[PDB]
Amino acid sequence: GDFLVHHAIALGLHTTTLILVKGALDARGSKLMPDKKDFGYSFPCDGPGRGGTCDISAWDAFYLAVFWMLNTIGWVTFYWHWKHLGIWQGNVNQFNESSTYLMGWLRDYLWLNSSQLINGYNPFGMNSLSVWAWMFLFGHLIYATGFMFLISWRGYWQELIETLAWAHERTPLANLVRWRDKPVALSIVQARLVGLTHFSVGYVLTYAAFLIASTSGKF
Amino acid sequence: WVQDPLHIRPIAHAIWDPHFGQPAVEAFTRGGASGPVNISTSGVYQWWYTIGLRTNQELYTGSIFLLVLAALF
Amino acid sequence: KKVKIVVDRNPVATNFEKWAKPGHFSRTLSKGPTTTTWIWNLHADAHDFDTQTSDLEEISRKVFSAHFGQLGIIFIWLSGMYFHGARFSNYEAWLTDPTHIKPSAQVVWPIVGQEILNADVGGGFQGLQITSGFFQLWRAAGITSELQLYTTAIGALVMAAAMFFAGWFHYHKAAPKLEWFQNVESMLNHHLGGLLGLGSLAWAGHQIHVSLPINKLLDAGVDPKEIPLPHEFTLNPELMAQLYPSFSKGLAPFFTLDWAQYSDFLTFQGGLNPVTGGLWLTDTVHHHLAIAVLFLIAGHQYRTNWGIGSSLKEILEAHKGPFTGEGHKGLYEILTTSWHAQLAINLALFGSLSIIVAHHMYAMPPYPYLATDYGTQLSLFTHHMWIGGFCIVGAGAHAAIFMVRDYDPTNNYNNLLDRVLRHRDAIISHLNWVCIFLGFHSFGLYIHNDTMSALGRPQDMFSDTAIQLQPVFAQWVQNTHFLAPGFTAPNALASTSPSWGGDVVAVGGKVAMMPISLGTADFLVHHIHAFTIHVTVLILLKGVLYARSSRLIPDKANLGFRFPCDGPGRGGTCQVSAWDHVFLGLFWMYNSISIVIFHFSWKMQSDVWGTVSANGVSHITGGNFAQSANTINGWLRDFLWAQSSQVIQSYGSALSAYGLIFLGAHFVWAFSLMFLFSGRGYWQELIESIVWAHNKLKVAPAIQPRALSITQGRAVGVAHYLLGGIATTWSFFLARILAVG
Amino acid sequence: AALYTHHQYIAGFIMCGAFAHGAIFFVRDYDPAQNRGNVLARILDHKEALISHLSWASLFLGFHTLGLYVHND
Amino acid sequence: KVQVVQPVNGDPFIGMLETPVTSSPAIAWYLSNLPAYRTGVSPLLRGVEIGLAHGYLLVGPFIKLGPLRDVENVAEIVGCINGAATVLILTLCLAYGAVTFQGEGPQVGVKTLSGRSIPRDPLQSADGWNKFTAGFAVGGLSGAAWGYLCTQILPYY
Amino acid sequence: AFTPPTLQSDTPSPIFGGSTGGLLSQAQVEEFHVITWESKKEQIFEMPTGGAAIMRQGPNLLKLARKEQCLALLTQLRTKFKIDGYIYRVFPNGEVQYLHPKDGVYPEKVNAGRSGDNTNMRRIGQNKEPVQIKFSGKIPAEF
Ligand code: CLA
Ligand code: CLA
Ligand code: CLA
Ligand code: CLA
Ligand code: CLA
Ligand code: CLA
Ligand SMILES: CCCCCCCCCCCCCCCC(=O)OC[C@H](COP(=O)(O)OC[C@@H](O)CO)OC(=O)CCCCCCCCCCCCCCC
Ligand SMILES: CC1=C(/C=C/C(C)=C/C=CC(/C)=C/C=C/C=C(C)/C=C/C=C(C)/C=C/C2=C(C)CCCC2(C)C)C(C)(C)CCC1
Ligand code: SF4
């Protein structure tokens, strides 16, 4: 089990390093964009020409590498927590036998150690673990919210905001109130940053709540 | 916690939340505190206990010293 | 003028010359596969007949032949189903014990330990438990024997061959002309009476002479091998009279207008059969006969080759009011010359019909021993819900396609379409506001309940114990339906479904149907459904209304229907086309249907499905929905976490496959994220480095590898996301229902 | 557990920042004439080999780790 | 033959349309008689009326739904809550006035639907908004205070 | 010998029933554009703001918000009805500025007498390095 998980860790590290190194080495320019250095470190793209240039700047490479870093750290922490969970309870056989397949990881670690956490508050009452259950759902919500900025792109929101602006400029009583800044949709790079921030915050909060609630409700 | 480092849960800080209900206030009282508190999880208790700190006066003195150091910086 | 059969002889030669030339249908795919993008373009435009030719006649001919091919494929699938039910099933054994033997129609070969999937369903048979409901359908039809299933399979193969021959004949030998396809009046007259009406009448006849006697004997209790054959009942009024005395009078009462005599087999009872748990077959016969007469009468309204009849154009142009200017003028020309508009209307109504079918089927089980089969019920409901949602999204997509290609301003002036396009801002703004209001007042309630429960204040929640949100309107309608028999339906002996109220209908110790009480949780989930449906409608409608132009891009129609963007200018125009609106609508539809199926599953497992022990009803989950569905934590713990133990503990058993797919789907879904959060530039540069590595060893391919286009990347991401999510829910639902049902 | 997880997540974020700033350096402070022929210019001269081998190692590790896990499942 | 939907003031190239919801005689009269659309009335008085109405209608929600709704002293707590809400929306009005009105510019004229030239609303000025904000505070606080009195009085309630 | 043609305020507008995608409040405090063309017959055309209008027989005037809308309408007229139009920019103060057919000759056609603005005499890769222009609010393309 340690062999397989260590190779998974090697995978995460190699892929994260590949993304970061590729972005750093191709930051000055590539075949698709020979003069990338003239556009700076961060820029939305280079237009839909030449087949498409979405996520071509070095900033975008770092952006894509943050996901892989979170995944690698998640694998590392999952391994450490499960091994120590079995060691603290004097049952190394659980990890020695269930870590060789993914179903053991999902059933004997995630589903098994989440009973007390999700029971912090229920239709019967609440205990000191309710804060961790609320933080668990909070992290899930932030992560899913980030999925919006990650999947939806700037175009749909610009038209929607234009429609909203028309509605405000034509609604009586509310016409007396005006906006000092023209409302516009988030920038492409700004949207990627907001989505990444939400993803990372939800990831960290969810794992922190689960980790503390699982190792605290038992010991 | 110094007297019983294995049978007492460290306290991080107090909790003053007007939204708390009676069951929440009673459920967050643990390490012999007067009211709802948060159980420490950063390990500052073990570190401070290992470096020689033993009373609350020493911790307060260290906090004041760090405050003066921050102002100096 | 004058509806007639106009056809062109031998228009296309039959040979394999074009089979060896991929991309022959497209003009842009003639320069050969210089890059890998050509391969994807070859499949992305194979069925886009509008681009392959500018002639409507050729497009119509292609559509007709494609329909024939699809019919042949469906017939092959049906033949396979019947053949498997006749050779690799336990249908004969299941007939003798339909309450304990679990239906199975698939057997796996022993190769790598997979023989464990052959579960001990019953009746000395081993195989995979099926949830398609074919056994119940066959029993309702009176199949009884396996030879009949084999005969049906052979007939289906013959029908498939006939369908394929019809497509080839209509595309290469006798191809109909454009004027033949534009006969909407004749087509509607034939599809209303000659298709629906005639089909309903034929099914009613079969039910009268085959389903009624065989099923009556089965219900009364008779060995399936002892019941007389269908022809012995269809051609012998004496035996059929022994089962139904009204038949001793023959057809005389029908022609003498004394239909009351036929009240024994043409009843209007209601409810469900207490023996089988399904609808009364006599009631279904009466229903089919009535709808057949109605459809046959309706198939005589449109004018054809005679003076009598109505004109669709005349009726449409005559419906104009003071608020719509010109009215429906121009709609006939749009629906008689654009295939995309017809496809949009048909897809929308078709998906809505599928959803209605799912509702009516779980509410009123139409087949014997179907309600007590929880696995089949849940599977059928979820499957039809997904089909309906997909069809609706497709309807929106094709509406946008028509607005982009077939729209013509010179033909739509001051009509309904023009007036709608002239105030799209108001429609979109109001829909956006209603979506925000629904989201707040629907999800914020759950969040408020979660916060109160976590704060130790259950008395401040929106539950049946604290602030109640009773659905008074739904409860009133339900009670009205319960009190309908003998009052607002004197000739009805019982309500349409036991869900409206009344006693509990249980078959074989299991609850087949029972009243479904609605409370605060039902109110919350219904508003959640309304909110999700509204958001999906907002996305699709916005794409259809702004597919041509917009304030940001005034010439969006020139860019086409499917384009990635319009550059990074104006702050960003990513996903501004109608195709992208459909791409987002797919995600929202998945979310809506997922919540709908989750609500149905939890509600039926907590307030309907269960066992009767002479002391009450023991539901599967004990009724925890009424006390936990008001919070998100309850859905995560009491539904997702509690019911997932069946799929995560299936390893080493027959349901192990469900445990494997459950994980596999989770992978595919996550895989989709790679294509949803990435861009084309990164992959193109990475491919550049890999190409350098290949060139260093003289192994670079001439078909220059290229990263998937922006649109293709989005399509792959959405396809994988929905496949993974739907498959995960499928595995979870099937494993849970097959382990506790 | 909390300390280990906290420090590992901090390390991951800091590593990502290190590579991000390295890219920023290449796009804003690197001078090819001042580093003509040294280790930087040479490592940039064969960046394709580096990226190709990183991709091969990642593909190998992923293929085999996932294959072994799926086989066991 | 009648067309109830016409372009705004006959101009078909302005982002607005005249419908029986916007150009209805009764609707237009009621909307025009509101304190917000009184170009000739002092902004302070209009603000007082608006604040009175808003403050009075803002007590109810906390009275019947506040955390202490099941206690006899709910009316007082809610009166204070409405006062706090009025003070908050008061600082909101002040911030909006300080940001919106901070400069001058030769703006375009304003005319009626018939074409009669009218001066710009005095409320859309640095001093006009300040007077309106002050009236909203007095009216808003008075409305909340009256909300508590109505609870004590009103024989039906 | 070309002079910018003056904008006539007596030009009638095309027959349109009205829409919600027209001018907003930006045209009252910022600017708007006007496109005037000449049609040989009364015919239905598609407006950039949604809907369908009818251009009269003779001079037609249409006021839009952005210049892109006017250019899109002009492109539609040129590629569908073979009609040439003129675009002007109008400010709230009352100033009209000629636009698109700047010198009477379309930009796609060389006129010999224009300004060769923004035309570097080097290649795309011959620009100065970003490190050589550091601490200067300029990009390598402006050197
Ligand atoms: C052996 C009989 C035969 C032959 C030799 C041809 C030959 C030809 N046909 Mg034709 N056709 C036939 C039968 C035949 N057809 C039948 C039975 C139908 C009714 C469905 C049609 C309907 C039809 C249409 C509408 C059109 C043609 C066209 C053509 C010409 C070029 C297209 C082509 O064949 O590309 C090669 C096609 C294939 C190699 C196979 C197509 C893909 C199949 C049908 C998919 C089947 C689904 C299958 C179950 C897989 C799906 C699930 C899977 C993922 C597991 C070509 C000369 C086209 C034409 O005239 O060009 C302008 C034209 O548009 N045919
Ligand atoms: C009573 C007359 C009649 C009947 C029964 C049908 C039946 C059908 N038509 Mg059709 N049609 C008719 C008249 C009729 N049509 C006329 C007069 C016109 C010209 C205006 C059209 C033009 C038309 C078009 C353009 C299309 C259809 C299509 C269809 C099929 C829809 C698939 C479906 O959902 O049904 C259920 C499927 C079945 C019940 C499968 C069983 C099929 C059996 C054999 C019914 C065959 C009926 C047929 C008309 C018999 C005469 C053919 C004969 C010369 C051999 C369906 C089988 C669509 C299609 O899919 O193409 C094939 C389609 O594209 N029809
Ligand atoms: C009667 C139903 C129907 C019909 C006849 C059409 C017909 C058409 N559609 Mg359409 N559509 C439909 C329903 C339908 N659609 C629905 C329900 C949706 C919502 C999802 C859409 C959404 C849609 C979009 C967004 C687009 C079309 C487009 C088109 C046109 C080109 C299709 C093509 O050749 O692309 C190629 C077809 C394929 C590549 C087949 C691929 C099948 C998918 C990707 C795989 C799914 C996996 C499958 C479920 C099995 C999984 C197992 C797997 C592991 C092996 C064509 C005229 C395109 C167009 O340009 O219109 C002009 C367009 O972009 N459709
Ligand atoms: C869980 C993640 C998530 C969330 C919360 C949302 C939320 C929303 N989406 Mg979205 N979406 C998501 C995922 C998510 N989406 C993903 C992954 C995709 C990719 C397919 C999309 C694609 C998408 C599209 C295409 C659209 C939306 C739209 C919307 C908005 C609908 C309006 C509404 O619901 O009213 C109310 C808002 C909510 C219920 C969200 C929760 C807010 C809570 C309940 C209020 C809490 C108050 C706060 C705590 C108090 C302040 C505290 C202080 C510290 C700040 C809404 C804000 C639509 C829109 O623009 O609106 C019309 C729209 O068209 N989404
Ligand atoms: C000693 C550490 C250090 C230092 C001094 C810098 C310094 C710098 N960085 Mg850098 N960076 C670092 C570490 C560091 N970084 C690390 C660890 C990462 C990996 C995450 C990055 C990744 C990074 C990127 C991608 C970029 C920089 C950039 C920059 C430059 C401009 C920064 C800026 O614009 O400020 C602005 C500061 C912000 C916008 C704050 C960000 C908001 C955070 C992320 C949201 C946090 C929300 C919070 C957690 C929510 C709580 C949850 C609760 C509500 C429930 C600057 C010289 C930029 C640059 O060089 O320009 C070309 C650039 O693009 N950095
Ligand atoms: C579970 C989700 C998931 C998965 C499986 C992957 C997988 C992969 N990523 Mg990715 N990534 C993801 C999420 C995911 N990512 C997300 C959310 C992001 C943020 C947007 C990224 C961002 C990202 C970047 C920036 C990069 C990668 C790269 C890679 C590849 C690394 C090479 C490797 O590991 O070899 C192993 C290969 C696999 C594990 C794929 C599985 C192989 C399949 C299962 C075998 C096929 C068998 C069967 C025939 C299936 C076909 C059936 C079908 C025909 C019906 C790899 C294929 C890097 C890369 O391209 O490497 C060169 C790269 O640069 N990823
Ligand atoms: C809960 C009900 C479910 C439906 C959702 C309702 C919300 C939608 C609101 C959007 C309105 C947009 C106005 C369009 C404005 C518009 O279309 O123009 C006015 C429209 C045009 O009619 P014409 O005079 O032009 O008629 C000529 C036609 O042949 C050509 O269109 O006439 C109408 O009033 C339509 C009715 C709209 C109102 C629909 C509500 C119907 C009530 C149904 C109540 C059901 C439950 C109670 C039953 C007891
Ligand atoms: C002592 C000892 C030993 C030895 C060891 C060794 C000798 C090793 C090592 C080590 C190492 C060796 C480590 C490392 C690490 C590294 C890293 C982690 C990296 C990095 C880098 C980066 C991040 C970069 C950045 C950049 C870029 C990219 C651009 C330009 C430049 C710069 C720099 C800015 C052993 C254990 C055996 C045993 C015990 C004892
Ligand atoms: S889709 Fe967005 S990121 Fe991609 S090329 Fe177009 S504008 Fe740039």
Check D29 against F131: CB less than 8 A apart: yes
Contact C322 E15 (CB under 8 A): no
Q: Round to the nearest angstrom and report the end-to-end CA distance of chain B.
A: 33
- H/E run at residue B19: none
Given an 8 Å threshold on Cβ–Cβ distance, is F13 in contact with E13? Answer: yes
Domain with E140 in it: 6-152
Q: Tell me the pairing of strands C617-619 and C610-612.
A: antiparallel
Residue E90 located in a structural domain: yes
How many Cα atoms within 13 Å fall on the side-chain side of residue C595? 20
Distance A192 CA to ligand 9 centre (A): 12
Is the distance from CB of A63 to CB of C587 less than 8 angstroms?
Answer: no
B and C make contact (3+ CB pairs below 8 Å): yes
Task: Tell me which chain E residues have a C-beta less than 8 angstroms from the C-beta of A176.
Answer: 36, 121, 123-124
The answer to the question of residue E157 being in a domain is: no
- Contact (Cβ atoms closer than 8 angstroms) between residue F20 and residue A166: yes
Tally the domains of chain E.
1
* C-alpha separations of C440 from A139, C433, F43 in Å: 19, 11, 48
Pairing assessment for the beta strands E110-111 and E17-18 based on DSSP bridges:
unpaired
* Strand partners of residue C611: C510, C618
Three-state SS annotation for chain A: CHHHHHHHHHHHHHHHHHHHHHHHHCCCCCCCCCCHHHHCCCCCCCCCHHHCCCCCCHHHHHHHHHHHHHHHHHHHHHHHHHHHHHHHCCCHHHHHHHCCCHHHHHHHHHHHHHHHHHCCEECCEECCCHHHHHHHHHHHHHHHHHHHHHHCCCEHHHHHHHHHHHHHHHCCCHHHCCCCCCCCCCCHHHHHHHHHHHHHHHHHHHHHHHHHHHHHHHC
Whether residue C503 contacts residue C548, with contact meaning beta carbons closer than 8 Å, is answered with no
Report yes or no: C573 and A188 within 8 Å, Cβ to Cβ.
no
Measured from the CA of C339, which atom of ligand 3 is nearest? 57
For F101, half-sphere exposure in the C-beta direction (CA atoms, 13 angstrom radius) is: 17
Tell me if C526 sits within 8 A of C441, measured CB to CB: no
Are C241 and C216 spatial neighbours (Cβ–Cβ below 8 Å)?
A: no
As a whole number of angstroms, the longest Cα–Cα distance in chain C is: 92
SS3 per residue for F65-103: CCHHHHHHHHHHHHHHCCCCEEEEEECCCCCEEECCCCC
Structure tokens at C720: 């994988």
Is F23 an 8 Å CB contact of chain C? Answer: no
Give the orientation angle of helix C578-607 with respect to helix C374-405, to 10 degrees. 160
Integer Rg of chain D from CA: 18
Atom 23 of ligand 5, residue of closest alpha carbon: D17
Starting at the edge strand found earlier in the chain, the sheet holding C510-513 runs C505-507, C510-513, C610-612, C617-619
Select from D24, A37, A68, D48 the least CA-distant residue to C686.
D48
Interchain pair E5, C323: CB under 8 A = yes
Measuring CA to CA, how many Å separate C327 from each of C13, C416, F43? 46, 5, 21
Task: Find out whether C335 and C184 touch, Cβ atoms under 8 Å.
Answer: yes
Three-class secondary structure of residue C568 per DSSP: coil
Tell me, what DSSP letter sits at residue F6? P
Cβ neighbour number for residue E157 with a 10 Å cutoff: 7
Q: Amino acid identity of C365?
A: P
Q: Residue type for C645, please?
A: S
> Annotated binding site of E for chlorophyll a, which residues?
30, 36, 54
State in Å: Cα C359 to ligand 3 middle: 26
Contact B63, B41 (CB under 8 A): no
Distances (CA, A) of C420 to A129, C336, C413, C581: 54, 21, 11, 19
Distance CA A162, CA A154 (A): 13
Q: What phi and psi values does residue A92 have, to the nearest 5 degrees?
A: -75, -15
Give the span between the Cα atoms of C356 and C361, in whole angstroms: 8
What is the three-class DSSP state of C35?
A: strand
How distant is the alpha carbon of residue F24 from its chain centre? 19
Give Cα separations from C553 to A156, C426, C565, F72 (angstroms).
12, 18, 10, 9
Q: Do residues A197 and C583 touch, judged by C-beta distance below 8 A?
A: no
d(CA E8, CA A170): 11
Neighbours of A132 (CB within 10 A): 22
Yes or no: say if C685 and A30 are a contact pair by the CB < 8 Å rule.
yes
Q: Judge whether F55 and F45 are in contact, CB under 8 Å.
A: yes
Residues with Cβ < 8 Å from A50, sequence gap 6 or more? Answer: A32
Method: cryo-EM
> F68 burial class (0-12, 13-18, 19+ CB within 10 angstroms)?
middle
Question: Rounded to whole angstroms, how far apart are CA atoms C552 and F66?
Answer: 9
Angle at C658 between CA C653 and CA C661, to 5 degrees: 130
Distance, in Å, from the CA atom of C711 to the CA atom of C37, rounded to the nearest integer, reads 12
Contact F92, F29 (CB under 8 A): yes
Beta-strand (E) ranges in C657-712?
A: none
Dihedral angle, C-alpha F135, F136, F142, F143, nearest 10 °: -70
Query: Contact, C153 vs C147, CB < 8 A?
Result: no
* Chains B, F in contact, 3 or more Cβ pairs below 8 Å: no
B40 marked among binding-site residues: yes
By C-alpha distance, which of C681, A188, A39, A23 is closest to D28?
A39
Output the residue whose Cα is nearest ligand 7's atom 20.
Answer: C323
Q: What is the CATH number of the domain that holds E114?
A: 1.20.1240.10
DSSP label of C171: I
CA–CA separation, A78 vs A102, rounded Å? Answer: 12
Indicate the residue of C325, C413, C424 with minimum beta-carbon distance to F50. C424
* Closest by CA position to D66, among listed E79, C535, C671, B19: C671
User: Which residue out of C314, C316, C324 has the highest number of ligand 7 atoms within 8 Å of its CB and is therefore the one to mutate?
Assistant: C324
Give me the residue from A35, A38, A169 closest to F25, CB to CB. Answer: A169
Which distant-in-sequence residues (6+ apart) come within 8 Å of A127 by Cβ? A119, A120, A121, B27
Resolution in A: 2.7
> How many angstroms from the chain centroid is the CA of residue E25?
21
Q: Which residues pair with F60 in a beta bridge?
A: F37
Cβ of C507 closer than 6 Å to ligand 3, yes or no, is: no
Residue with tokens 């399509």: C715
Do β-strands F58-64 and F32-39 pair in parallel, antiparallel, or remain unpaired?
antiparallel
CA separation for the pair C213, C227 (Å, rounded): 9
Neighbours of A196 (CB within 10 A): 20
Within a domain: residue E1?
Answer: no
Alpha carbon separation from C335 to C67, C81, C179, C312, C332 (Å, rounded): 19, 37, 14, 11, 5
The residue among C652, C708, C711 whose CA lies nearest residue C681 is: C708
Cβ-based neighbour number of residue B66 at 10 Å: 10
Amino acid at A185: A
> Is residue E68, in this structure, part of any structural domain at all?
yes
The residue type found at C323 is F
What is the rounded distance in angstroms from the CA atom of residue C709 to the CA atom of residue C33? 15
Q: Structure tokens of C152? A: 């049906």
Are the beta carbons of C277 and C369 closer than 8 angstroms? yes
Query: Which residues are F59's β-sheet partners?
Result: F38
Q: Single out the residue of C408, C236, C281, C261 nearest to residue C333, CA to CA.
A: C408
Q: How many helices (H) and strands (E) does chain D have?
A: 3, 0
Q: How far is the CA of C536 from the CAs of C388, C392, C670, F1, in angstroms?
A: 13, 10, 23, 58
> Which residue has tokens 């007709």?
C64
Strand, helix or coil for residue D27: helix
Alpha-carbon distance of C48 to C178, in angstroms, equals 18
Question: Any residues with CB less than 8 A from the CB of C224 and at least 6 apart, and which?
Answer: C92, C95, C96, C144, C145, C218
State which H helix or E strand residue E32 sits in. Answer: helix E25-32
Looking at the complex, does the CB of residue F27 fall below 8 Å from at least one CB of chain C? Answer: no
Nearest-atom index, ligand 8, CA of A20? 28
Question: Could you say which DSSP state residue E116 is in?
Answer: -
Examine residue E65 and state whether it is found in any structural domain, yes or no: yes
Is residue F23 within 8 A of residue F65, CB to CB? The reply is yes
Question: Pick from C146, C191, C221, C452: which is nearest to C298 by CA?
Answer: C191
Of C651, C667, C647, C631, which Cα lies nearest the Cα of A111?
C647
Q: Are C544 and C403 in contact (CB under 8 A)?
A: yes
Q: What share of chain F is helix, strand, coil (3-state, %, to 5)?
A: 20, 25, 55
Contacts of F16 in chain E (CB under 8 A): 7, 12-13
DSSP letters, C111-167, are: SSSGGGGSB--SSS--BEEP-S-HHHHHHHHT--SHHHHHHHHHHHHHHHHHHHHHH
- Mind giving me the DSSP string for C266-288? S----S--TTTSS--HHHHHHHH
- Minimal CA–CA distance to C130: which of C734, C656, C739, C730? C734
Vertex D52: Cα angle to D50 and D58 (nearest 5): 100
Per-residue CA distances from C242 to C215, C239, C262 (Å)? 14, 5, 14
> Residue F75 and residue F77: Cα distance in Å, rounded?
5
Q: How far is the CA of C62 from the centre of ligand 2 (A)?
A: 15
Residue among B45, A16, A27, A206 nearest D11 (CA): A16
Domain locations in chain F as residue ranges = 1-143
End-to-end CA distance of chain F: 35
CB C30 within 8 A of CB C331: no
Which ligand places an atom closest to the C-alpha of A61?
Answer: 6
Are C570 and C576 in contact by the 8 Å Cβ rule? The answer is no
C-beta of residue A177 within 8 angstroms of C-beta of residue C673: no
Longest dimension (CA), chain B: 45
Cα-to-chain-centroid distance, residue C563: 29
Instruction: State the angle between helix axes of A2-25 and A58-88 in degrees (0 to 180), rounded to the nearest 10.
Output: 160
